[PDB]
Amino acid sequence: GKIIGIDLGTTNSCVAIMDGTTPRVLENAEGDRTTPSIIAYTQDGCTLVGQPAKRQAVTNPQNTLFAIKRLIGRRFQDEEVQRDVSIMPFKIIAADNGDAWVEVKGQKMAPPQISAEVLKKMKKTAEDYLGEPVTEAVITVPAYFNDAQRQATKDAGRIAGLEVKRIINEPTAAALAYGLDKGTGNRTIAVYDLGGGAFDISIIEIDEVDGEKTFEVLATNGDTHLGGEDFDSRLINYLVEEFKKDQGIDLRNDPLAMQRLKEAAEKAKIELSSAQQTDVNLPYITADATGPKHMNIKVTRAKLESLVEDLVNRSIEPLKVALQDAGLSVSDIDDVILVGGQTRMPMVQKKVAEFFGKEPRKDVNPDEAVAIGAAVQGGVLTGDVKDVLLLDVTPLSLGIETMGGVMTTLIAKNTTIPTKHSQVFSTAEDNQSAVTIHVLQGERKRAADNKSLGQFNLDGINPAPRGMPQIEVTFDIDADGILHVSAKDKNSGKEQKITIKASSGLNEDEIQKMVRDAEANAEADRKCEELVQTRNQGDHLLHSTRKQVEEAGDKLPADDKTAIESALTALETALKGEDKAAIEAKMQELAQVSQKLMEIA
Numbered sequence: 001g002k003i004i005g006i007d008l009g010t011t012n013s014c015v016a017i018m019d020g021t022t023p024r025v026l027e028n029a030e031g032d033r034t035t036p037s038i039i040a041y042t043q044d045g046c047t048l049v050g051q052p053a054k055r056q057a058v059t060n061p062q063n064t065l066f067a068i069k070r071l072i073g074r075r076f077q078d079e080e081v082q083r084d085v086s087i088m089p090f091k092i093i094a095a096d097n098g099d100a101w102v103e104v105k106g107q108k109m110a111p112p113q114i115s116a117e118v119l120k121k122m123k124k125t126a127e128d129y130l131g132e133p134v135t136e137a138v139i140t141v142p143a144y145f146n147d148a149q150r151q152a153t154k155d156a157g158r159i160a161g162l163e164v165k166r167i168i169n170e171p172t173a174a175a176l177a178y179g180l181d182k183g184t185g186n187r188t189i190a191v192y193d194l195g196g197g198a199f200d201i202s203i204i205e206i207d208e209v210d211g212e213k214t215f216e217v218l219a220t221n222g223d224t225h226l227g228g229e230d231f232d233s234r235l236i237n238y239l240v241e242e243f244k245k246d247q248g249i250d251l252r253n254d255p256l257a258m259q260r261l262k263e264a265a266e267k268a269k270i271e272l273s274s275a276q277q278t279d280v281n282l283p284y285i286t287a288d289a290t291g292p293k294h295m296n297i298k299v300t301r302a303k304l305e306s307l308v309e310d311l312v313n314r315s316i317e318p319l320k321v322a323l324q325d326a327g328l329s330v331s332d333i334d335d336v337i338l339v340g341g342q343t344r345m346p347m348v349q350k351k352v353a354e355f356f357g358k359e360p361r362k363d364v365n366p367d368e369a370v371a372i373g374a375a376v377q378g379g380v381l382t383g384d385v386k387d388v389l390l391l392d393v394t395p396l397s398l399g400i401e402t403m404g405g406v407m408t409t410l411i412a413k414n415t416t417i418p419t420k421h422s423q424v425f426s427t428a429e430d431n432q433s434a435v436t437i438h439v440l441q442g443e444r445k446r447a448a449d450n451k452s453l454g455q456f457n458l459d460g461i462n463p464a465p466r467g468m469p470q471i472e473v474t475f476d477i478d479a480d481g482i483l484h485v486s487a488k489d490k491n492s493g494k495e496q497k498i499t500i501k502a503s504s505g506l507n508e509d510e511i512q513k514m515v516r517d518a519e520a521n522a523e524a525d526r527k528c529e530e531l532v533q534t535r536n537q538g539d540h541l542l543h544s545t546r547k548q549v550e551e552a553g554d555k556l557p558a559d560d561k562t563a564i565e566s567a568l569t570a571l572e573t574a575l576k577g578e579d580k581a582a583i584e585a586k587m588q589e590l591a592q593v594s595q596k597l598m599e600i601a
């Protein structure tokens with residue numbers, strides 16, 4: 001059926017469909033156009049996604065997962081992940097291959113399985129609206145996502161039962177959403193995307209010649225670990241330091257408080273985008289060697305600005321680089337476009353506006369443009385959106401490690417994709433049976449300072465003197481921005497097998513297994529839902545039967561009043577537990593003993 005567009009966000013997720021030529025954002029079951037990217041695993045075997053997960057995070061801190069996009073496709077020993085380990089209320093662990101995973105109720109889980117739960121909610125949302133199955137999606141990622149991050153996101157799509165037709169870069173999608181109606185003016189635009197977790201800047205040319213729109217990304221830069229979460233973190237730190245002075249208490253040793261404080265800090269932050277001052281007012285934050293304590297701290301807009309100004313400044317540097325790479329000056333920009341909730345902060349808008357010397361547009365929805373853009377991208381693939389052309393780029397240099405630990409660039413950053421690069425490799429020694437190619441992403445001159453994609457071993461090479469064999473290695477980057485390395489003996493043309501060691505990501509076996517796990521979860525969810533309906537029916541029966549007992553009054557035999565009241569009580573207890581059969585049972589017993597009472601009612 002339809003190709004849905006899914007903005008899979010660090011904080012919030014959004015799904016859009018292509019309704020002919022006009023894109024629509026869909027409301028979820030709770031009635032909302034966006035869904036918090038939060039996943040909770042309950043004590044009773046249910047998975048909660050979004051607002052329901054959000055509400056119970058305080059009672060279930062270790063099993064409520066959020067900001068998973070900031071772990072996906074990363075290594076456990078990464079500096080960013082290591083910092084998050086001591087901050088998150090859930091447990092971050094090392095997978096067998098060294099990847100950053102999470103542990104939930106004693107089960108090791110890969111970030112793609114967790115993100116798949118969000119993707120599933122979005123899929124179902126679309127299916128609820130369309131009244132038919134959805135099997136295909138366009139999924140978004142930050143422009144500055146690396147190979148492992150992109151492939152791990154694509155794997156999340158697959159685990160969610162989605163065929164991922166395209167992985168689209170977030171600013172590119174926003175550009176598609178903007179270029180849909182609007183100019184149209186052979187324009188050159190800067191897309192500034194600051195979200196809950198990631199920051200992207202893309203310079204994009206949109207020229208329309210003979211009713212054929214061409215969207216070309218000139219340059220892209222960013223930081224995949226800079227976002228609203230970091231803004232929140234600065235305010236949280238300020239609050240604990242203030243509380244440590246005014247009460248003498250370190251409040252961080254309390255996980256219930258932290259979580260309510262995290263929500264408090266984010267709420268204050270958002271409040272300060274329209275107020276000049278607010279209060280972080282949390283009563284009963286925790287009880288000490290006395291009794292229930294309450295934090296009440298005033299925070300001005302200026303205080304907040306002062307706490308996050310350096311984070312805002314860190315987003316200005318990549319603008320300079322991207323302008324350099326695009327070969328443009330600030331005055332070459334026709335339009336500045338802000339995307340992401342974090343751009344609603346007056347200071348962000350102000351700093352961006354004074355950098356470009358130009359006001360950002362006000363007619364772009366910073367929450368929905370990306371989802372809408374994904375949906376448009378899907379439309380281009382089916383054909384339902386004609387005369388649109390997309391030329392995106394890869395954001396990072398791809399190279400190999402050479403003698404001395406030095407980087408040799410094979411494909412430079414900002415190269416248009418899809419792209420191919422071939423190079424012939426050979427042996428360095430007599431009877432060499434294997435040659436290793438160490439592939440990396442990054443701009444640094446030394447291999448150790450860049451992101452390793454893995455050791456690509458061309459094994460099983462026929463005996464020969466030095467430099468005999470001619471193995472042509474081809475490096476492909478597809479439309480998704482993802483690398484594919486293949487090899488071939490130059491001379492004959494017969495392929496050459498490639499083994500990847502020391503790499504990150506899920507293998508085919510893990511993925512197949514995880515697909516089945518997600519199907520099983522979906523089935524358990526059905527069971528949790530059914531038990532909720534049963535509890536609902538049980539409560540209706542309680543009430544109905546009490547009204548009837550009440551109405552009969554004096555006329556009811558004492559024997560029957562005793563028995564019915566006992567069975568009502570028994571049902572009430574079952575209804576408080578989590579066992580569907582026991583509820584059905586006590587309901588059935590209640591109906592039997594109250595059968596003559598109900599009959600005359």
Ligand SMILES: Nc1ncnc2c1ncn2[C@@H]1O[C@H](COP(=O)(O)OP(=O)(O)OP(=O)(O)O)[C@@H](O)[C@H]1O
Pocket residue numbers: 008009010011012013069194195196197198199227228229266269270273339340341342343344345366367
């Ligand atoms: N009015 C506001 N003022 C300032 N910040 C806000 C406001 N509303 C939301 N935010 C922040 O913006 C972030 C959410 O933005 P958004 O939903 O665009 O991010 P995302 O797409 O989920 O994240 P990413 O794109 O980084 O993966 C959160 O940090 C949130 O607290």
Ligand SMILES: [Mg+2]
Pocket residue numbers: 007009010170195196340370
């Ligand atoms: Mg986003």
